[PDB]
Structures are given as structure tokens and as C-alpha cells.
């Protein structure tokens, strides 16, 4: 068929002919007039029954000869005299003209379609996602009129209480009924032009203009609404999406459409809201101005089961007025003022031009309405009764379908309307069965409903009680909500295989992810023997600190808005925002690496940097409250996050705005001093004390009450507890600043000797100055061997990979290898006694030194970068050398553009040679640097150093060179200058941060560097290794000092979440925003109130007169 | 006192304290007219 | 993906069409340069015929680039071809080269001493100067990069805007 | 004139890139020493006798639904930004 729509659905056509009129108004032989003016109970004319066999049944008059027991026919059975057929219509209405050619859809189906057959097209054919609500509108069919307030206010709600939910509004479609006014709201309050509220307007095939235009299989019906008042067929209202053109076989008349409307409104109450919720999608009913049949069908809902509620609004008009007028009377139904039933019937008499014989049962119909004054939510539009109508509808469903507060909560959890919950469920005395609240948290978590999580926490859900092992196993193992495909890709990687078919994730498998994401030696609670034993076993089946487990969940499941919510709660907020930043960042790098799904990788690096900026903005807030304790917050062992540190994490997330913040730069300096007080002391005295060891004793140290915030080593804290003299030499030599200035004076004694050897002639054997030099590099090599073996990891593959990843561990390896190549060729060589420097092996190693020397002078930029003025230029000399490579390629294209012609034009008798590789590159390079070779330009001139190069064509080179240098100096060299000017301020505000971040890795290499410099560091290796064959810097806080510190972090977080609140709520652009929103809501209650005053004074002067 | 950022500050604080005595006062008016039309009727 | 659709998929990729020219052109500039720099005999050498061959087939590739430049007006095709910086320079560089080969090959030979024939010399020196047109091509190829090209485009927008400082 | 010409030479470059890439979609396969074969084997074969987006039918439909969607947002976000 190529169309499932017409494969399943059918169409009704009057396949028989039933006249309904006999009397010849004109032209006594009725056969003539019966052709054109005698219609069937088919509605269509007897000749409009084409129906090819029935077209030949346009015989003399038609089927059933004139007499035929005259009153015989007059029935038109819709069963056999109206058969079915495959649908000839199905398309997309264009609505040509009125707003950007808004679309809608239809089929033209028969009402034969069983209720379940009608639901199983709306979802899968038209891709209408299942609703959370249904706002069938059962008011007046004939057009009616409203007041400017109620017109727009009810247009606020049908947009508000339906855009939030799914809200398949059920209308009549036509531009005359309630369908009329609802569409007018859809334009005035035009929502964000998107999939807005998809109104599913059931239309009859009866009162419909352009019915022929609808007859097209996959046809864009060029539809146009004529407002011709002479017209009688009702045009479809403009603002309606998908239509259901119910086909009864007839035209012009009502009927079948009402049958479908129950029969879809009853199966959508049989479909479930969501996999998590067990309820069915509820149904409401709204009444605008009603009518006689309306007052009947309003009631039957209040009677029939399930109790479909109703939202009959009072202000609209004729019927709805009185159905609400009686709500102001008839208290609890059965109680009935018998003196008012003549009065209200007198109001019924005047509105419907209504009869008194019929005044008992219509009045009676309003009684059982009033016997059910519990779910008939008579919205008093006038006042603030129950709220704006948006809330009234959603409030009508909860209060009235005999539903537990849980069952009320699970619905609002689906709608994602919290305001309903805070003010109609979390109101007052209410049963709140505690197990229920727990189960609701399980649902708000799996989806993403942060706002109900906050709500439930703020109404008694202690996560300690609600975070057991099997519950949290689900929270990873749910497709019932926003999911991250990485997590099921990470787990199958670490398991090194393929997940079995079902595979509910175990929390062990998560630990193997976070220990892989965070990395290094991070060891999570899940993998440890305690958890791994109580887990396989199954308040021990709870967790100690739950929001540390949910925060690693919302960050593996890419639920930021939860992570920001679960981060700000709990404790350790600065370690949670630097673990998160390391989880995401370590997820983002997996995304870029493996491409099995969409990228997602820049969505995370923005999520990480959002956590890696709350930490930094929380360090500042602490550093601005107590600079001392705020440096304890960076070094206290955490013990929930793998015996780690709020500053070793940032370094692992490579977060520079923290490691290069001013509190991680004081501490790094207070750690750089050591026990020394280099505030009271001076750098002269360090060097003076290193070479005069007794001068160590004339130094101003710090007390162990000043070194509180500094992390100290294992035995370092042992000393201070249990200043004596042996604790002066230990305190100095184990200071980083001393470890530094005790190397820099061996290294600057290395470079003064190796340089002395490089420069001075070199004999068969090394000299005293040269053995000390070999000795440094050897012991400096070992110091880098040992720097690998003790680089705080278990994976040799990862230690070696992080060692060579630092700029100098390579260069040192280049410089250490080369030197022993050098010593290899220098010492491991023969000796040509008659003349040294003939042995090209000796020479070779000789010249390894003279070039290896350059590696060691650039070391000094490691030592020289300790300064805060210098280092940020040493880091610039690299960030330009990179960013300038392409200006410099051009300058080498300009250099061969000149050198190849200059060398060809001048030296034309050149056999192939390697000097043709120098001479095309040599002079044009020195030209850039002040040289011009002036007596070589114009080689035929008298003043020539090259009077032999003169010959045919050599007059071209002054021109080539003129163009060359113009391009070099006046264009390309000033393109460098211009480059270095405009990349200076950038690279200067980066090379600082790159420097302040390499400072960590520099200082915290001296806290584990030995004491002794690398000529005689070997003793501190000897006396660390043979003693090792016989068998970090932590913050030691007593017990109360942990307590005072936690009280400080809590205090500083509280201010952070309180000052941001102030900087925004008490800014300017926000303050203009409120002043706008106030003066909005003022001016409404100005003109409204001020009107009423004038309606008083015009009366008050008439009351007295 | 006659700048801009300060003048937005006051205009905020005024429209705060206005709007309190708008809705409060404007309520009471409606509680009169619903009565006044019933005092005479 | 079948095998014949691997070779068709690669060789008909632009990135491949590029890096399959830039390694013929950088093999052109390594040879023409070799000929420019090295002495030049009565007849071209192996390194020099390949060079003539590139420019010829590179000329045709620019002939055909006109005839298939998506238009009907020859007056408009030719006008949009010469309107690009290099279609001129290439025409300067292709003409000049065959002027060069014209004078280099279409010339006599003073056996006692080359470089006396000022026609030979003349074309010899067309090459040594035509070479500059082909090194500036590399700024067409080198401008594919998003860091480099935006300097190659600066070296022109300054040479224009600086003419008057340079007259002074 | 560096910051000017740098915020222009990018745009001049990104615009010559079209005319560069979309010259290779119609450049032959073979480089210009032996592109002649792809001329030979385009011309004598021519004596014997562009890059388009091939969308099925539904993909035109999904694309038009996308353009309509993105225009609607454009005329709706400007409305909000002001
Ligand atoms: C004395 C006579 C002989 C020597 C004189 C001649 C010496 C010649 C010159 C020498 C200059 C030496 C310094 C530069 C080399 C890299 C240093 C480094 O750590 O780079 C990186 C390690 O990046 C890695 O991926 C890990 C290891 C890379 C090793 C590459 C060696 C290249 C040099 C070849 C061997 C040359 C030895 C020649 C001798 C046989 C660090 O990062 P980055 O570099 O800042 O940025 C790159 C970023 N990246 C990490 C993502 C990649
Ligand atoms: C943290 C990790 C990074 C650091 C790496 C550390 C490791 C360093 C890496 C080194 C790798 C480089 C190769 C080894 C060097 C020698 C190569 C060579 O050419 O030797 C020559 C000498 O060979 C001899 O045996 C005689 C001289 C003594 C050798 C001293 C060099 C080894 C010292 C290493 C101490 C390192 C331990 C350092 C402590 C850890 C052989 O050739 P020849 O004799 O010249 O040829 C004769 C020719 N003729 C007769 C014609 C003249
Ligand atoms: C014909 C001549 C042509 C030119 C020849 C070559 C000369 C010119 C070149 C020279 C050096 C080339 C190799 C090293 C530099 C490359 C790396 C770099 O630039 O910076 C990078 C590393 O480096 C730094 O961040 C610090 C910079 C170190 C200073 C370099 C010493 C130069 C002095 C030598 C004096 C000796 C002179 C005497 C010698 C006899 C930083 O760059 P970035 O942008 O952050 O990139 C990302 C980095 N990341 C991945 C780590 C995050
Ligand atoms: C398009 C953009 C604008 C360009 C601007 C203008 C471009 C330049 C225009 C220059 C004017 C023309 C100069 C040459 C004139 C003829 C020379 C001649 O006959 O003999 C000369 C030969 O030497 C040469 O021919 C060498 C070329 C001259 C130097 C080129 C200029 C470079 C510097 C300036 C560039 C910028 C200057 C700016 C201008 C103010 C000398 O006489 P001779 O005796 O034959 O030689 C000695 C031999 N003998 C010893 C055996 C006897
Ligand atoms: C600008 C203000 C200054 C004045 C302007 C007025 C200009 C008046 C100029 C007139 C030029 C004609 C005079 C020379 C001819 C006579 C013979 C002669 O000397 O031949 C020389 C050829 O040298 C040349 O041909 C020189 C260059 C010619 C072009 C002149 C510059 C063009 C304008 C600028 C733009 C150009 C592009 C620049 C870049 C943009 C050879 O002589 P030689 O070198 O001594 O060699 C002798 C030895 N040998 C026999 C062994 C070989
Ligand atoms: C090997 C030995 C001999 C050669 C070595 C000596 C060579 C000497 C130097 C040569 C420099 C050659 C390269 C630059 C030429 C222009 C390139 C181009 O396409 O420009 C433009 C084409 O603009 C047009 O209007 C269409 C054609 C203009 C032709 C101009 C030729 C000028 C050189 C005369 C012949 C010289 C040949 C001398 C030889 C007899 C493209 O635009 P644009 O330029 O980016 O900007 C201008 C914009 N415009 C289009 C609005 C105008
Ligand atoms: C898209 C297109 C853009 C590019 C344009 C493409 C077209 C290229 C445009 C070219 C125009 C330039 C003029 C033609 C070149 C020769 C001029 C000359 O001086 O010739 C000389 C040689 O003449 C001979 O006939 C003998 C040598 C063979 C000639 C080969 C050159 C032509 C090849 C063209 C192949 C092009 C086809 C490429 C495919 C399209 C004549 O002078 P002479 O003999 O030295 O004089 C006597 C010397 N004596 C005194 C020492 C005895
Ligand atoms: C005495 C000597 C005095 C000086 C002599 C002369 C030397 C100085 C000059 C030299 C070159 C002069 C001719 C070419 C450049 C002119 C055009 C230009 O500037 O840019 C224009 C085109 O070009 C570009 O947009 C790209 C620029 C390419 C770089 C030029 C090559 C330089 C290298 C050569 C190395 C060889 C060196 C060795 C040689 C032996 C763009 O300009 P624009 O502002 O956008 O204008 C509008 C453009 N529009 C109309 C297209 C929209
Ligand atoms: C690895 C780390 C080691 C630590 C360093 C300490 C151990 C290294 C120390 C000493 C080792 C050498 C001892 C052997 C005897 C010396 C002989 C000698 O050369 O004498 C010369 C002086 O000395 C020198 O010229 C070289 C040694 C001193 C200067 C160079 C090293 C300075 C750095 C290290 C110290 C400062 C460090 C400060 C930096 C902050 C004098 O003799 P001459 O010049 O040949 O001429 C004599 C006259 N005659 C020829 C006419 C007869
Ligand atoms: C990805 C890279 C791009 C693809 C490549 C680009 C495609 C095109 C690639 C190359 C073109 C073809 C080159 C080989 C043709 C010549 C063979 C040869 O050497 O003959 C010659 C060998 O003989 P001989 O010993 O030199 O003797 C002199 C001969 N003579 C007397 C005739 C002078
Ligand atoms: C148009 C596009 C073509 C595509 C390219 C492929 C075709 C071109 C390939 C080969 C063509 C030549 C074949 C003939 C035989 C060679 C003879 C010869 O010169 O031998 C020399 C080597 O060769 C050279 O020095 C010149 C050729 C190779 C280097 C220059 C081109 C490199 C680019 C192309 C390739 C890489 C491309 C890389 C680009 C990214 C050796 O001898 P000599 O130096 O004279 O000294 C001898 C000394 N003796 C007398 C003592 C013994
Ligand atoms: C040349 C010079 C220094 C450097 C390099 C290259 C490569 C990266 C390592 C860096 N060294 C370094 N020493 C420091 C001391 C204090 C603070 C920051 C420091 N950074
Ligand atoms: C010197 C250098 C390059 C150029 C000129 C002159 C003249 C204009 C054409 C330009 N070449 C070019 N190649 C490109 C490759 C990629 C993207 C953009 C590109 N622009
Ligand atoms: Ca100078």
C-alpha cells in the first residue's frame, strides 16, 4: 500500500439512496426536482451519490420508486447502506495565509475505527509523543463572546498548563465552537515557535467547508478560510495541528465525531505516563459557555467511572455561567434552597430562552453536578480562586480522583510542575507514608527532576536512609531517563570484553571506571575489600556519605543540573568540585578518543570547567576570610576521596586557575621556606648558611605553631612534637629553598667547570675539572632514574610515560646519553700522540660536549624561572616560537626565491654539489641580520670582491636583492615585530599561569628531592637504597583542628552561595529586570483598581445626590 | 545620589515599597465596591 | 566496502588530489631548481624534460579549466580566469618558460664556450627568474593551513597599504 | 594595520577556500605530470559522446522541516534579545 493509514483506516460513503422529501414545490413531475434538490439522510443530495454503481442508479428519479409506501425509506442505515472503503483523503492542510503557512494534518477516517485502533495511529504515524495531560474542551458549539480579561487570562492557562505537560487538547477543530476561542489563545500567547501544544482537533466530515479539497491521498490541501457571512459550512480554526476528520458517510450534519472523542479520551486514560509511573495519563475537561447537550455531558463524567473531572469556568457565558452560578448556591449538593430553584430557573429561563416544562430535568441535571461538588472545579475567574486557571486544571486532577499524596506527587513529578507540589501536595497535615517519599526520590533521580529532589530533601528525605546498595544499582541501570552512552562504553572497556546481554551494572564496575577516570592511584570505596565483601554478601547496607555517591553518579550520567544541586549540598564542596571536574574532563578525553556515538566531548569540558570554577571561586572566598585556614583546606587528607587532597586533584584535572590562585601560591611559598622564615631572613643568609654551616644557627626559623597549615613529612612532624641544634641542621637542609640554592650552587659550579673543559684543551685522560662533571651527570642521571621509580604510581607504563612527558626529562636524557656518548668516544678512544684532534672519534665526542653544553645552559632557565618576573618570559620564548612558525616558513620561501636565482644567475657553470645547498640559503639568511654584502652586489662594478662572477645576467641580482630585503625587513621582519606586539599581552597573561602551575611541580619535587646536590646526592641514594634493602608531605591536624577546619569550609561555602545571590539580586541589569516585572504587575492593578474607583464616584454622588 | 547605578537602586527600592502599598490599597478598594453596591443595591 | 571502491574513494578525494599534486610540485621544484642551479647542456636533461612536461600538462590543465568554467560566454570565462591572481602569473610563468625553452632549445650552441649565445643565456635566465613564480605558488599550497594563509594574505594587504610610506 | 588585516585575511582566506576546495572536486585525480592521461581519457572519450546533494525523497522533507524550524527560532530569538 505504501500507506499504513489507508491500509488500516477506511472511509464511509452512502452506498444507497434514501430520498427524504416528496412534495413537488416546483415542476410536478418530481423526478426532475428530485435530481437537484431532494437530499438523503446521507446528508448529500441523491445525485451526489456518485458511488459508481449508484451513479447509474440515477435512473428516472433514483432507487426506490416514488410511491414505495411513501414513508418507507427515511432511515439510511449507516451499516449496509453505508459501506467502508480505503481512505481517499490523507494529507497535510496548508492553511494558505495567516502566519508563515502553519501546518496541520488529517486522514478522514470512519468512526468504525475501534478505540484502540484510533490510539495506535496518533503515536506512530504522526510521531506525536505521548502526552502527560489531556484538556478536551467540551463547551459551546455555537459561537459566543467573552470579556477582555477572561479572554487573555484563559489564554494564559491553556498555554501554561499544556506547554509544561504534553497536553493533547481535544477540540472540534471548526472555527465556531470552543475550538474557535482556544485557537485565538494559541496566537496571542504564541509560545516559542517549536513543537508547541499539539492540539488534536477532531473534526466531523459534516460542518466543514472545502471538503472536496480534503479528498487527496498525500495531498497538500491548498486550504483557505473564507469569512463569507453568507457561508454556512464551518471552516477549520486556524491554530490547530493534527486533525481527525471523522467520517460518518454524511455531510453538513453532526454525529459520529462525538463517538470518537470518548473513544480516544478513554484509551489515553489506559496508556501510562512513563515507564516509571504506573498510573495512566489523566484526562480533564474544560467548559467554555456550553449549551443544553453540554450540561448533559458535563454531568455524565461526574457520574461515570473513572471519575473524569471537569473545569467548568464561570465567566465564559450562557451554560457555564449557570453551572457555576449554582456552585455559589446548592451547598454540598442535596442541601437546596427551595426559594432559589424558582430564581435560578428564572436565570435558566432567560439564557437559553428555556421552557418550564423542561425546567425540572435540566435543573435536575444541575443537581447531580452539585452532588459531586468535589471534582467539579468551578473556577471563579473573577478572584484568585485556587490560582490562575493553569493551576486550577492541574489542581483539579490531584484533588478529586481519590488519590494518595504519593499518587498526586508521582503525577506532578511527570508533569514537572513543582509549584503544584509546593502548594497543593506539600501543604499541611497529610499522611506522607515514609516509604512513599523514598520511592518518589527514586523516580525524580532516575529522570532528572532536580526541583522535586530539592523539594523532597526540604520535606524529610535523609539520603543516608535512602541510598542503599540495590537502590543505587538501579540509578546507573536505568534507560528511564537522560542517559550517557559513555558509561556503557567505559564499563565494557575496563572489563576488557563485552557486556553480557542483560547486564545490570554492579557498583564494582563503577569503581573500575572512576579509578580509571580519576586515574593514578585513586582507589574508590567500591573496589575496596570492605565494600566488595558486604556487596557480594547482600545500617551497614547504607553509605556513610551519600551525596558523594550521587555526585559521581550525576557526573557519569551527564546530569549537570543534579550535580550542581548535589554538589552544593553535603560537605567537602571543594573536593567534590575538583573530582567532578576530573571525572568529566576524563570522560571528554574518552569521547574524543573513541567515536561510537555523537561527540559530547565539548559538552563535558564545559561541564568540568563549570565545576573547576566553583572551586576557584570558593578558594578566593576562603582566602578572603582567613588566609591561614584556607591553606589548610588545600592539604587536609580527605579520606572519602581516596586519601587525597583538594590540590592534588586540581593538578590531575590540570586546573590552572586554582594551582595558580593566590592561596595555592602563598602556601607553595610557605612550603618553599620550610622551617625557615624567609620573611625575617634574607636570601643572602641562605647561601651564606649553605657554605658556612654554622651560620645556620644564626637564622630566624618558624615555630611549629606557624607551620600548622604547611603539610609536613612523616618524620618532620615527629621532630617538632617530641629549638635544639640537631633540629636546626635538619630544618635547614630539608627546606626546599635550601635544596634549590644548594643545587644551583653545584650546578653553577658544574657549568663553570664543564665550560672550563669545553673551552680548555682536552688531554688523553679527563682532568680533575672533567671527572667532577661526569660525576654530576651520572649522579644526576640516577636522580632521574630514581625520580621514575618513585613517581607515585603502579604502572611502569604510566610512570615512564609521565617522565618523558616533561620537557627536560627528554632533554636531560638527550644530554645524559650524549654526554656518555661523548665520554664514550672521548675516553673510549685511541690517542694519536703526534697530534690530537686527528682521531675523529675523539673529536666527535669533544664536539658532543661543546654541543651538549647548550642543553645545560637552557637548564638555567628552569632555575631562572623560579623568579616571578623572569619565568613569565621564559614561557613566552616558547609560546611564540610555536605561534611564529608560519611567518618563518614564508621568510624561507622568500629566502629561496632569492637564493636560487642569485646562485643560478651568478654561478652558472655549477656541477652538482652540496655547496649548491648552502649557497642558496647562506647569504640570504645573513642578509636578514644587518648584512648586505655590498661589494658583492653588482659584481661587475669596480668596487667588487667578486670581479670574476661578472658575466651575462649578473645585473639582475641588485634588483632581486632589492626586492628580497624589502620583503624581508620592510614586510616580514615587521610582521614579526607586529606579531610579537599583539601576541605579547596574550602570552603574558598565560605564561604567568603556565609558570604558576609548573611551580607546583617544581616545589613539590623538592619536598621529595634529597638534601644533597647531584655530585654527592649519591650518598642520599646509597643511604636510601641499601637501607631500603633492610626493610608524602601530609597536613598533620590534631583532632580539634580538623573540626575547626571543617567549620571553616562550611562557613566559606555558605558565604559563597550567599554573595553570588547578592551580586545578582542587587546588581543593575537584574534590577532593571525586576523594575520591569514590577511595573508590569503594578500597572495591571493600577488601571484595574483605578477603573473601579471611577465606577464608585459616579455612583456615590448618585447614592446621595 | 544623582548618578545612574544609584538611581536604579532607588527606583528599585521605591517600586518595591510602592507595589506593597499598591496591591494592599488596591485590594481594599475592591472590598469597598463589592460592599458599596450592596449598601445601596 | 569493496576494494575497487577503496581506490576510487581515495584518489577522488580532494585532500588526496591536493597531497598528490603537492608531492609532484615539490618534486617539480626540486628538479627545476636542480636544473636552474646545475649547468645546462645543449639538450635538456632527464630532470629538465620532466619539468617542461609538468608545465605543459599544467598549462593544458588551465586551458581545460577555462573551457569547463561553468558558463556559456567565452568572453566571461576568459574574463573570470585571468581575474584570479595566479591564472595570470601562471600564464606569465608558462609563456616565459616556453620563451625560455624556446630560446634554450630553439638556439644554436657555441661549442667552444656556452653562455656566449645570448639567446641561450636569455632563456637560461628566464628560468632562473621564472622559478620565483613557482616558489610563490607554494603560498597557494601553504595557505591551506589556517595559521599560515592568514599571513600570506597579510603580505599583500600591507604591500598595498604601504605604497606611500615607501614613495616617501 | 595588523589587527585589521588579521581579521580580514582570515575572511579573505576562508573565502578563497571555497574556490580552492571546489576546484579539486572538479580537478582530475592525476597530478600535472601525468594528468594528461585524465585529459586524454576525458577528451577522446568526449568525442565519442557538478557535486550535488542526493537526498532521497523523505530527506528533502525532513530538511524542509528543519529550515522552517530554524527560521521560526530566528524570528523568535531576535524578538527576545530586544
Ligand atoms: C649533543 C649532540 C646531540 C644532540 C644535539 C641536537 C639536539 C636536537 C634537539 C633537541 C631538542 C630536545 C628538546 C625537544 C624534544 C622534546 C622534549 C619533550 O619533552 O617534548 C614533549 C614530550 O612529548 C612527548 O610526546 C613525549 C616524548 C617525546 C620525545 C620526542 C623527542 C624529539 C627529539 C628528537 C631527538 C633529538 C636528539 C638528537 C641527537 C641524536 C614535551 O612537550 P613539548 O615538547 O613542550 O610540546 C609537545 C607536546 N606533546 C607532549 C603533546 C608532544
Ligand atoms: C634516567 C634515565 C636517563 C639517563 C640515562 C642514563 C644512561 C646513559 C645512557 C647511555 C646510552 C648511550 C650508549 C652508551 C655510551 C657509550 C657508547 C659508545 O660509543 O661507547 C664507546 C666507548 O665504549 C666503551 O666501553 C669504552 C669507554 C667507556 C664507556 C663509558 C660510557 C658508558 C657509561 C654510561 C653510564 C650511564 C649510567 C648513568 C647513571 C644512571 C664505544 O665506541 P668507541 O670505543 O668510541 O669505538 C672505538 C673506535 N676507535 C677504536 C676506532 C677509536
Ligand atoms: C636556521 C635557524 C632556524 C631556527 C632554528 C631554531 C631556533 C628557534 C627555536 C628554538 C627552540 C626550539 C625547540 C624548543 C622550543 C619549542 C617549544 C616551544 O616553543 O614552547 C613550548 C614549550 O616550551 C616552553 O613552554 C618554554 C620555552 C623554552 C625556551 C626555549 C629555549 C630557547 C633558547 C635557545 C638558545 C640557543 C641558541 C644557541 C644555539 C647554538 C610551549 O609552547 P605552547 O605554545 O605552550 O605549546 C603547547 C605546549 N604544551 C603541549 C606543553 C602545553
Ligand atoms: C616598480 C616599483 C618601483 C621601483 C623603483 C625603482 C627600482 C630601481 C630602479 C633603478 C634605476 C635603474 C638602474 C639601472 C640603470 C642602468 C645601469 C647601467 O647602465 O649600468 C650599471 C650596471 O649595474 C646594473 O645595471 C645593476 C642594476 C642597478 C641597481 C638596481 C637598483 C637596486 C637598488 C634601488 C632599488 C630602489 C630604488 C628606488 C628608486 C628611487 C652601472 O654602469 P655600468 O658601467 O654598466 O656598470 C659597471 C660595470 N663596469 C665597471 C664594467 C663599467
Ligand atoms: C628609479 C629612479 C632611478 C632612475 C630611473 C631611470 C631608469 C633609467 C634606466 C634605464 C635602463 C636601461 C639602461 C641600461 C642599458 C644600457 C647597457 C647596460 O648598462 O646594460 C646593463 C644591463 O642593465 C640593465 O638592463 C639594467 C636594468 C634595466 C631596467 C631599468 C629599471 C627599470 C625600472 C625600475 C623597475 C624595475 C624592477 C625593480 C623592482 C620593483 C649591463 O651592464 P652592467 O651591469 O654594467 O654589466 C656589464 C658587464 N658585462 C658586459 C660583463 C655584463
Ligand atoms: C620569467 C622572466 C620574465 C618575467 C619576470 C618579471 C615579472 C615581473 C612581474 C610580474 C608580476 C606578475 C604577477 C602579478 C600580475 C597580476 C596578477 C593578477 O591576476 O592580477 C589581478 C588581475 O587583474 C586584472 O585586471 C586582470 C589581468 C591583469 C594583468 C596585469 C599584468 C601585470 C604584469 C605585466 C606583465 C609582467 C611580465 C613581465 C615579463 C614580460 C588579480 O587581482 P590582484 O592583482 O590581486 O589585485 C588587483 C585587482 N584587479 C583585478 C581589480 C585589478
Ligand atoms: C591556459 C594557457 C595559459 C598558458 C599559455 C600556454 C601557451 C604558451 C605560450 C607561448 C607564447 C610564447 C611564444 C612561443 C614560445 C617560443 C618563442 C620563441 O622565441 O621561440 C624561439 C624558438 O622557436 C622555435 O620554434 C624553436 C624551439 C621550439 C619552440 C617551443 C616553444 C613553444 C612551445 C609552446 C607550448 C605551449 C602549449 C602549452 C599547452 C597549453 C624562436 O626564437 P629563436 O629560435 O631563439 O630565434 C633565433 C635564435 N638564434 C639567433 C640563436 C638562432
Ligand atoms: C626596489 C624594490 C622595491 C620593492 C619591490 C617590490 C617588493 C614588494 C612587493 C612584492 C610583491 C608585489 C606583487 C604581488 C603583491 C601585490 C598584491 C598585494 O599586495 O596583495 C593583493 C593580492 O595578493 C594577496 O591578497 C595575497 C598576497 C600574496 C603575497 C605576495 C608575494 C610576496 C612574496 C615575494 C617574494 C619574492 C622576493 C624575492 C624576489 C627576488 C591584495 O591586496 P588588497 O589590499 O587586498 O587589495 C585589494 C585586492 N583585491 C582587488 C583582490 C580585492
Ligand atoms: C659539580 C659541582 C662541584 C661544586 C664546585 C666546587 C668544586 C670544584 C672546584 C675545584 C675543582 C678543581 C680542583 C683541581 C685543581 C685546580 C687547578 C686549576 O684549574 O687551577 C686554576 C684555577 O681553577 C680553575 O681554573 C678551574 C677550577 C676553578 C674555576 C672553575 C670552577 C668554578 C666553579 C666551582 C666553585 C665555585 C662555585 C660557585 C657557583 C655558584 C688555576 O690554574 P690555571 O688556570 O691552569 O693557571 C695556573 C697558572 N699556570 C698555568 C701558569 C701554572
Ligand atoms: C606522491 C608523489 C606524486 C606522484 C608523482 C608525480 C607523477 C609523475 C612522476 C614522474 C614522472 C616520470 C619520471 C620517470 C621518467 C623518466 C625515466 C628516466 O629516468 O629516464 C632517463 C634515464 O636514463 P639516464 O640514465 O638518465 O640517461 C639519460 C637519458 N637521455 C639520454 C635520454 C637524456
Ligand atoms: C614533475 C613531478 C615528478 C615527480 C617526482 C618524481 C620523478 C623525479 C625523479 C627522478 C628523475 C631523474 C631520473 C634520472 C636519473 C637521475 C640522475 C641524477 O640526477 O642522479 C643524482 C640524484 O638525482 C638528483 O640529484 C636529481 C633528481 C633527484 C633529486 C631532485 C628531485 C627530487 C624530487 C623528486 C622525488 C621526491 C619528491 C618529494 C616531494 C615531496 C645523483 O648524481 P648527482 O647528484 O648528479 O651526482 C653524481 C656524482 N658523481 C658524478 C660522482 C657520480
Ligand atoms: C625552559 C625553562 C623552564 C622550563 C622549560 C623550559 C620547560 C618546562 C619546565 C620549565 N621549568 C620550570 N622551572 C620552574 C621553576 C619554578 C617555577 C616554574 C618553573 N618551570
Ligand atoms: C599568494 C598566495 C596565495 C594566494 C594568492 C597569492 C592569490 C590568491 C589565491 C591565494 N591562494 C590560495 N590558496 C589557498 C588554499 C586554501 C585556502 C585559501 C587559499 N588561497
Ligand atoms: Ca643592522
XYZ file of N, CA and C in Angstrom, chain A residues 761-764 831-839 842-843:
45
model
N 91.809 22.925 26.306
C 92.226 21.730 25.594
C 92.015 20.505 26.459
N 91.969 19.354 25.807
C 91.480 18.136 26.420
C 92.440 17.006 26.103
N 92.999 16.431 27.156
C 94.124 15.525 27.077
C 93.611 14.097 26.946
N 94.540 13.137 26.933
C 94.179 11.740 26.727
C 93.189 11.272 27.780
N 94.517 7.413 20.891
C 95.120 8.731 21.059
C 96.281 8.857 20.087
N 96.130 9.741 19.105
C 97.156 9.963 18.091
C 98.179 10.940 18.668
N 99.223 10.375 19.280
C 100.155 11.137 20.108
C 100.774 12.316 19.372
N 101.046 12.162 18.078
C 101.693 13.225 17.316
C 100.821 14.475 17.288
N 99.505 14.294 17.199
C 98.563 15.405 17.091
C 97.209 14.902 17.554
N 96.680 15.485 18.622
C 95.283 15.253 18.937
C 94.408 15.893 17.870
N 93.102 15.650 17.972
C 92.102 16.158 17.032
C 92.241 15.579 15.627
N 93.122 14.594 15.440
C 93.106 13.766 14.247
C 92.161 12.585 14.410
N 92.052 12.051 15.623
C 91.128 10.966 15.916
C 89.703 11.493 15.846
N 87.594 10.863 18.923
C 87.859 11.829 19.980
C 87.182 13.154 19.678
N 87.485 13.716 18.507
C 86.848 14.926 18.006
C 85.342 14.829 18.107
